[PDB]
Amino acid sequence: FNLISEKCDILSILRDHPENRIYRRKIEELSKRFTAIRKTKGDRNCFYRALGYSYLESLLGKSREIFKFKERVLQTPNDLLAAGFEEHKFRNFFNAFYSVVELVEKDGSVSSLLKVFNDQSASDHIVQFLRLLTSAFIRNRADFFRHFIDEEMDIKDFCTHEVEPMATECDHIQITALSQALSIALQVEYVDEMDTALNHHVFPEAATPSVYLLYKTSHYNILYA
């Protein structure tokens, strides 16, 4: 369980910030709204790894939602090809993501899903697939990211340097892009060391979330409502 942990009580993370007034206040508040947490390894891949695991976990036992997600995943090779990725270079990463989706359908257990995401090889193939898909979806919608995010940014250089490579950190653009690319509704809770309100953002704005993440000390952990 070195990449994604077992579930722990929310108040168990007080020990990560001992004798810190502001962290203690916000974790106590968070505990009023959430019951449990899973921790992720802080290796620069934790956003992709957390979102991937938590979203597939939320599908277990839901036969219609699994059918619809499988249908979308089968079309993602077309997104990658439209953005200029070559099939023989994405094949190994697509095949690893499709395999874990069939595992959700066929096997249906938390234990089996958690083993794949703690297997360094399988888990890293999954993360690399999610990074390529994020890149593709941004590149195919460059005017949308320029219009609504940043009219001055260089989209192709940004994807090359800050999306595709393993261990590169995320920002709002990557979160928005992967959310839209797989139709995943997610809520991020923010815990920083300023004397401010505990606050959250939902991606996309309207939505009812599937997934809850805690962003704290540059790190994304998984929350349970």
Ligand SMILES: *CC(=O)/N=C/c1ccc(C)cc1
């Ligand atoms: C999301 C992820 O893997 N974060 C890792 C991390 C932890 C701490 C710092 C300072 C940078 C990156």
